């Protein structure tokens, strides 16, 4: 590796005429790229109606009937059909634009439940009725606290006195004075700002409470074929909201950080276990405890959710590393 010597034998001014000879290497032929790639390119369909300024002769239209029909999910997606209220509002959404729905290479998923699916109900797997009462209490407390600390106190503190709070003058080194609301913001931009802020804050608080409470599972019932589990969770108005989940969607898996297993909620005997419906990337937080679950079907639900939590999550031992993966047999057939 004497680099100078390498240079002394690498770039010689004599071989200049042959030095920059870009040569297509005569390497081994690869049928995938040297045979299959050309012929497939050679079979490219052609059209005579390319856009004069923007089209291309090989830009052929793909038939929608030739697009891959949806078989990924056995449940409908009403977001494709939208909501009548939106129609009644004539709202312009990105999930209802027909051009956006006109996928060129694939066929869009069906917006209605698949005809194979039966909507009949079966038997309840788990139930927790007092959760509704607890959630209602929490939501009512949140609403009452927001109203009190935000409106009732501000209403009196701003419109029912002339002396400001001690927090108003602790930082200002100015002579004391009284405050009145009849000589402030003559061009009342503060009124619309306060109204908009209050409306948006109330909406955000409601939506956040609904999202927080919407992950837990309040009532569950596996279907007659146990394919579509009907579950009622907590609704935003404190009521119940019913949905369905496909059997293949739910699972229980080790966390992404294997060191966090000991700090998992399900590690406790009276904890919580999350079934993750992978189809909608949804979560159903069942109470990890024996009292709430139904004895008859639990094992099957346990057998239907425990698929990735295997020995591989811990690794392979010294005697097991020999069988880590499937052996690749190459060259024994030529």
Site for other proteins in 215-274 (CB under 8 A): 215, 225, 227, 246-249, 252-254, 256-262, 266-267
Contacting other proteins within 196-215 (CB under 8 A): 196, 198-209, 211-212, 214-215
State the minimum distance, in angstroms, from the CB of residue 122 to other proteins.
14
- Report the residue from 10, 48, 175, 177 that binds other proteins according to the rule CB under 8 A: 10
C-alpha pair distances (Å), 330 with each of 29, 327, 333, 334: 18, 9, 8, 9
265: helix, strand or coil: helix
Convert residues 120-139 into a mask of x (bound to other proteins by CB under 8 A) and - (unbound).
Answer: --------------------
Q: Pick the closer one to other proteins by CB: 147 or 240.
A: 147
With tokens 């392979």, the residue in question is 316
> Two tokens at 146?
């927001």
Choices 121-129, 132-140, 184-192, 236-244; region in contact with other proteins by CB under 8 A: 184-192
Choices 23-31, 119-127, 129-137, 236-244; region in contact with other proteins by CB under 8 A: 23-31
Q: Pick the closer one to other proteins by CB: 144 or 204.
A: 204
Choices 119-127, 128-136, 229-237, 277-285; region in contact with other proteins by CB under 8 A: 277-285
215: helix, strand or coil: coil
123: helix, strand or coil: strand
Cα–Cα distance between 259 and 51 in angstroms, integer? Answer: 59
Going by C-alpha positions, the residue among 185, 164, 167 that lies closest to residue 176 is: 164
State the minimum distance, in angstroms, from the CB of residue 91 to other proteins.
4
DSSP character for 178? -
301: helix, strand or coil: helix
């Amino acid at each position: 590796s004497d680099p100078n010597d390498f240079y002394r034998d690498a770039y010689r001014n004599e071989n200049r005429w042959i030095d920059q000879s870009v040569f297509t290497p005569k390497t081994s032929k690869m049928t995938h790229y040297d045979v299959e790639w050309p012929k497939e390119l050679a079979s490219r369909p052609v059209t005579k109606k390319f856009h004069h300024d923007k089209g291309y002769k090989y830009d052929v239209t793909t038939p929608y009937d030739q697009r891959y029909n949806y078989v990924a999910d056995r449940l409908g997606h009403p977001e494709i059909l939208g909501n009548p209220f939106e129609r009644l509002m004539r709202l312009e959404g990105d999930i209802y634009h027909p051009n956006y729905l006109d996928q060129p290479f694939v066929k869009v998923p069906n917006a209605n439940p698949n005809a194979s699916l039966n909507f009949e109900e079966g038997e309840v797997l788990y139930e927790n009725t007092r959760l509704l009462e607890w959630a209602k209490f929490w939501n009512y407390s949140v609403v009452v606290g927001y109203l009190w600390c935000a409106y009732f106190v501000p209403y009196n503190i701003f419109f029912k006195t002339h002396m400001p709070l001690e927090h108003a003058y602790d930082n200002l080194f100015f002579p004391y004075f009284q405050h009145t609301h009849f000589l402030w913001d003559n061009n009342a931009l503060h009124i619309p700002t306060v109204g908009g802020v209050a409306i948006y804050a109330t909406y955000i608080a409601l939506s956040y409470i609904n999202n927080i409470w919407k992950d837990y599972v309040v009532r569950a019932q596996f279907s007659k074929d146990k394919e579509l589990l009907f579950v009622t969770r907590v609704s935003p108005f404190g009521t119940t909201e019913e949905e369905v989940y496909e059997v293949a969607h739910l699972e229980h898996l080790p966390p992404s950080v294997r060191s966090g297993v000991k700090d998992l909620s399900a590690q406790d005997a009276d904890g919580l276990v999350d079934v993750t419906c992978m189809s909608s990337q949804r979560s159903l937080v069942f109470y990890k405890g024996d009292q709430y679950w139904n004895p008859k079907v639990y094992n099957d639900f346990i057998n239907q959710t425990s698929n990735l939590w295997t020995r591989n999550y811990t690794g392979y031992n010294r005697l097991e590393v020999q069988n880590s993966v499937e052996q690749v047999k190459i060259g024994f057939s030529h």
